[PDB]
């Protein structure tokens, strides 16, 4: 099975600033990596798929990058609606389609 | 627009079974896989399994193959998950979500969640 | 049948010599079943041309089986692709 390890576990930042969070896979997942944002008490929202493609309606201040086993989500110019937990998930070759443990972003 | 509407909360005794639904609208049901995800309060997301409504193909997480049963009804555009022999470990929010049948790379729309509370 | 999701293959038996001058392999598939398998091979220097000569016609994943693939490859450095699942195959001889 693939294990996804997300880092940092949590971070606090201010509106207008930049943060980078990461997702490390235990094996090559060939860019089949999706990123979701979840606000407290709400449903997850797809942000990025295939490691770098923004989902419909996601603003360009989000950018996904990476390959092999190492992936990054960068949020420029943080906005208040950007708090919540971010999760990664892989879809390469065989289930389980495991999730990373989540990163909790708090807007300071 | 795409909508996945899930059924209401279930407050049940240990040992009960529940069946929850996920009604799809705004797209062609059989062109998309329906996956199910568990989330305990304050914890992370966990993949339970999925069904391809077009073909009936299912995949289950090994940890849930004795707990969850996934079905689908093409005529009503509805997917179902049944959970058996409930314990407090099963208290959680359960989401259904959509992925593309044939190039399944993301759960691109998510239902609002069904809360199951196992209680005395 | 529709084409098998190219991202849902894994090796069950990696490409190996068959003992009768061919290359045999076996994959498992984790998408909608049944489906037709996209299988090809590419020689170094020509990424566009499928050099795999299939002995198994119309390989498919069925509900209750399928996934065995047998092919012949030209001499030199090749890569076999079942969907996006890949394995190197250097072919000796001429």
Q: For every residue of A1-61, which 3-state class applies, written as one string?
A: CCCEEEECCEEEECCCCCEEEEEEECCCCCCCEEEEEECCCCCCEEEEECCCEECCCCCCC
Task: Look at C7 and A94 and tell me if their CB atoms are within 8 Å.
Answer: no
Pairwise CB contact (< 8 Å): A55 & B110: no
Give Cβ neighbours of residue C72 (< 8 Å, ≥ 6 apart).
C21, C22, C23, C52, C53, C55
Residue A61 zone, left/alpha/beta (φ > 0; ψ -120 to 50; rest): alpha
* B105·A55 Cβ contact <8 A: no
Contact B54 C32 (CB under 8 A): yes
DSSP sequence for C15-50: EEE-SSS-EEEEEEE-SSSSEE--EEEEETTBTTS-
| Rounded Cα distance, C83 and C7, in Å | 7
The one-character DSSP state at B104 is -
Technique used to solve these coordinates: X-ray
Assess contact for B53 and B74: CB atoms under 8 A: yes
Q: Specify the resolution in Å.
A: 1.8
Closest CA to A24 of A95, A93, A90: A90
- Which of A32, A91, A93 has the CB atom closest to C10's CB atom? A93
Give residue limits of the domains in chain B: 1-120
Mark the breaks in chain C: residue after which each occurs, C to N over 2.5 Å.
none
Say if CB C13 and CB C25 are below 8 A apart: yes
Tell me which long-range contacts A49-58 makes (C-beta under 8 A, separation of at least 24): A49/B105, A49/B106, A49/B108, A50/B105, A50/B106, A55/B106, A55/B108
Ordered DSSP codes for B16-28: --EEEEEEEESS-
Q: Who contacts B8 (Cβ-Cβ below 8 Å, separation ≥6)?
A: B114
User: Which candidate, A27, A25, A37, A31, places its Cα nearest to that of A52?
Assistant: A31
Tokens 């119309």 sit at which residue?
C58
Question: B28: which residues sit within 8 A by CB, 6+ positions away?
Answer: none
| Local structure of B100: helix, strand or coil | strand
Q: How far apart are CA B99 and CA B103, in angstroms?
A: 8
- Closest by CA to A22, choosing from A101, A106, A76, A78, is A101
Strand bridging mode B10-12 / B114-118? parallel
CA dist., res. C35 & res. B81, Å (int): 25
First to last CA, chain A: 36
How many residue contacts between B and C have a Cβ separation below 8 Å? 27
Cα distance between residue B79 and residue B76, in whole Å: 9
Give the mutation candidate from B55, B99, B101 for the C interface (greatest C CB count, under 10 A): B55
> Domain limits at A3?
1-108
Pairing mode of beta strands C35-36, C23-29: unpaired
Cβ atoms of A71 and A88 within 8 Å: the answer is yes
Distance CA A7, CA A104 (A): 10
3-state SS, residue B89: helix
Q: Could you tell me if C27 and C67 are in contact, meaning their C-beta atoms sit under 8 angstroms apart?
A: yes
CB C23 within 8 A of CB C17: yes
Chain C residues near residue B72 by CB distance under 8 angstroms: none
Contact in structure between A48 and A32 (CB atoms under 8 Å): no
The phi-psi region of residue B48 (left if phi > 0; otherwise alpha if psi is between -120 and 50; otherwise beta) is alpha
- Cα–Cα distance measured from residue A101 to residue A98, given in angstroms and rounded to the nearest whole number: 9
What's the CATH code, domain C1-94? 2.60.40.350
Instruction: Report the gap between the CA of B42 and the closest CA in chain C (Å).
Output: 31
Beta strands B58-60 and B114-118, pairing class: unpaired
């Amino acid at each position: 099975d693939i294990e996804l390890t997300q880092s940092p576990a949590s971070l606090s930042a201010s509106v207008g600033e930049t943060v980078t969070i990461t997702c490390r896979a235990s094996g090559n997942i060939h860019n089949y990596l999706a990123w979701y944002q979840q606000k407290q008490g709400k449903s997850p929202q797809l942000l990025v798929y295939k490691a770098q493609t923004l989902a419909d309606g996601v603003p360009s201040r989000f950018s996904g990058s990476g390959s092999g086993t190492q992936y990054s989500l960068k949020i420029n110019s943080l906005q208040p609606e950007d708090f919540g937990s971010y999760y990664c998930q892989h879809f390469w070759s065989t289930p389980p389609w495991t999730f990373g443990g989540g990163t909790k972003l708090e807007i300071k | 627009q795409v909508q996945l509407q899930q059924s209401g909360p279930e407050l049940v005794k240990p040992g009960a079974s529940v069946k929850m639904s996920c009604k799809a609208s705004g797209y062609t049901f059989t062109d998309y896989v329906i996956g199910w995800v568990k989330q305990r309060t304050g914890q992370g997301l966990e993949w339970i399994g999925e069904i391809y409504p077009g073909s009936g193909t299912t995949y289950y997480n090994e940890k849930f193959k004795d707990k969850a049963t996934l079905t689908a009804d093409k005529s009503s555009n509805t997917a179902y998950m049944q959970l058996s022999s409930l314990t407090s470990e099963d208290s959680a929010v359960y989401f259904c979500a959509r992925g593309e049948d044939g190039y399944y790379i993301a759960l691109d729309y998510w239902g609002q969640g069904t809360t199951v509370t196992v209680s005395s | 049948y529709t084409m098998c999701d190219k991202s849902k293959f894994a090796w069950k038996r990696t490409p190996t010599d068959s003992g009768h001058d061919t290359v045999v392999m076996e994959v498992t598939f984790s998408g909608s079943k049944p489906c037709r398998i996209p299988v090809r091979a590419v020689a170094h220097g020509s990424p566009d041309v499928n050099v795999a000569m299939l002995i198994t016609p119309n390989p498919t994943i069925e509900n209750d089986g399928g996934g065995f693939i047998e092919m012949q490859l030209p001499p030199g450095d090749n890569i076999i692709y079942v969907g996006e699942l890949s394995h190197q195959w250097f072919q000796t001889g001429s």
